[PDB]
Every structure is written in structure tokens, then in C-alpha cells.
Amino acid sequence: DFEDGEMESLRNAFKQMADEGRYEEIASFHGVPAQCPSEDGTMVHTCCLHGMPVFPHWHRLYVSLVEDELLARGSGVAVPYWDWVEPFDELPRLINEATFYNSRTLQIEPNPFFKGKISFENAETDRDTQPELFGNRYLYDHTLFVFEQTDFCEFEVHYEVLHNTIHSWLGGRDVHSMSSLDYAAYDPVFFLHHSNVDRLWAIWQELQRY
């Protein structure tokens, strides 16, 4: 439901976040350079929480964080949710094409949402979209069964497996992509994904109110 203005402003704000240091600094919270030794600690682990019921919470905050700094970079709107529950013949416009036309500069420029840079390994996030991603309506039924959940933890497990799905379909075969937990955050679509996931959680909460 975006407009050309909102999209170009989102692209620009995020760009400002991108050529400067920041977004990588945020993606490193989830990503492969590990920061979390515990409990003694004997070894170090990645910081993001994934087996636990507090998986949503964590990632919830993640999106919050990035959106905050997005807005502070002059974004007209907060981070949108990309609803993949509805089947699609193509990828969303914002993230799909490698280059967008800049109206203000009157020139074609690289879409910041196409790929994120991983400079500490001197690589870039790539995407190999599995054909299973395009057009399947199974996600509808799956989210439906996620919402059925009275208990919070049942909710959480189905919620998070369902969330794993998109990661897998989108960044399938490359090592530096959405599919591998280590490098998943560096691909901007991450928060575009995890806001949407968050939305689902939000809905459930409201359902629970009912």
C-alpha cells in the first residue's frame, strides 16, 4: 500500500543508514560475528535467540531498533511489513530490482534494499529464491494454525518455524544469504520480514485480548 514518495524516502533514509557505518553495526547484533560468551563462559555464541519462547521479543526489539534509526535518518514512514501470506508472482518492488530511478537526482541509482554489504568478511548478501516461494497459499493455513494457539509457547514454536520458512525459501543456496542464520541479518529484507512476523505476533496478542 506504499506510494512512490514513501518508497523513495524509505530508500534514501536507509541509504543514509547504509553508506555510513550504522546498519551493519545493527545487523552484527544478530549476525555471525559473535558477542555472547556464557555462562562462564567456555565458548562464544551468536547473540540472537532462536530456540527459546523469547525468540519473538528479541527480534521484535531488533526491528524496533532499526526502525528507530531509520526514522532518525529522515524517513517519511516507519518500517513496512511485507506480507508474504498473500502469494506473489514476483518479489516486492522495494527489495526486488537491483536499481531504482532517482527522481531528485534524475539518475538511476542502486537500490539499498536489494542487497546489504558484509564488509568484515568483505562480501555481499546474495539471494537464491526457491521456486517453492512463489505462489504457495499454504502460508495462509499455517498462520491460521499459529493463531489457534491459546498457550504462548505453542504459539511461539509454530510462529517461529513458520518464520524460518521465508528465510529458507528466499536465501536458499548461497552461504552469505537470508537462509543461513549467521549472515541473515545483513540482508535488509530481514527487518522487512521480521516486522511482518512481528505483525503476526501483534495480531495474536489482540486475538488473545478477545
Add this chain to the structure above:
Amino acid sequence: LQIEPNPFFKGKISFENAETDRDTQPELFGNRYLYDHTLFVFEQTDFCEFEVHYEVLHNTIHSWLGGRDVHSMSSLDYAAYDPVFFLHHSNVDRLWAIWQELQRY
């Protein structure tokens, strides 16, 4: 076993330190008029009559493929640096080829 950059996606213009880009005009998609255009190109008995319609027809795609960017297919200057160029022109050549054989018939 890894995903790599497509060589055909963009050519690089290193003497001006840029890369070819593409702003695809919406008319390029689902254009069925090109059919009839080509048909009128074939109709020509004389060579120059063939050449002019053939080449305007050829200009069409150049224009609509890399429209708005300066370093692109649309500008005659940098059009060659986009790989699609020969992919384009071979097809252009094919048309001429057909015409040649037509002329034989």
C-alpha cells in the same frame, strides 16, 4: 556452487568510471506493434527502403531498454557497453538475414 554476478546484467565503462544501467520504459512490455513494424520492413523491394524502416525499428528497442540513464542503451554513446547490445543487434541482424533470403525468393 555459488551465486555470482551475471556478466550480461551490466557492462562497465571504466574509462569514465561507471557502469551501464537500464531504465526500461513500460512500452517495451507487451508491445505487439513490433510485429507489424517488422512486417513492413520485410515488404521493401529496394535495399535503402529496407534499411531505413529496419533501422528505426532497431532504434525503438535501444530507446525503450535503457531510456532515462545517460550511461545506457538509450544513448548511442554508451549503448555498446551494455552486453544486451549484441544480444539486441544479432536479432536485428537476423531480420536482415531473413530479408536477404526473402530477396532470393
